[PDB]
């Protein structure tokens, strides 16, 4: 931790003496005896085990729609809405997702 000396006001470093280890410093004569036990408890933040990403549970969040896909004849469809500027003048684009045994992604 942080320990200072009361007489001078500077910090102390522990080093060996004659019969036992000593709390010494390099600014003023001041030594404290090291006795039965001195220790401090620290608690480093332990790591967490993270989540599995992906799956239909994640796709349950965004809302889907009812619209056929010309690949597997399913009304199953997720829709996405995005903004982007084309060459002439901006127009809102939309992404198409199939919620079936194939599950492909298109952009109209």
Query: Is 20 annotated as ligand-binding?
Result: no
Of the chain, the end-to-end C-alpha distance in Å amounts to 64
Is residue 50 near other proteins by the rule CB under 8 A?
yes
57 binds other proteins (CB under 8 A): yes
Q: What is the rounded distance in angstroms from the CA atom of residue 43 to the CA atom of residue 53?
A: 30
Q: How far is the CB of 26 from Zn ion (least distance, A)?
A: 8
Residue 41 to residue 88: CA distance in whole angstroms: 67
Interface residues toward Zn ion, by CB under 5 A: 5, 8, 10, 25, 27-28, 30, 69, 71-72, 98, 102, 104
């Amino acid at each position: 931790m942080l320990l200072f000396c009361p007489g001078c006001g500077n910090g102390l470093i522990v080093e060996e003496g004659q019969r036992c280890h000593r709390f010494s410093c390099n600014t003023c004569p001041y030594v404290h005896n090291i006795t039965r036990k001195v220790t401090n408890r620290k608690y480093p933040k332990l790591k967490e085990v993270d989540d599995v990403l992906g799956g239909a549970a994640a796709w349950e969040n965004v809302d889907s729609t009812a619209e056929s896909c010309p690949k597997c004849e399913h009304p199953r469809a997720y829709f996405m809405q995005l903004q982007t500027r084309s060459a002439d003048e901006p127009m809102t684009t939309f992404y198409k997702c199939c919620n079936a045994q194939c599950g492909h992604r298109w952009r109209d």
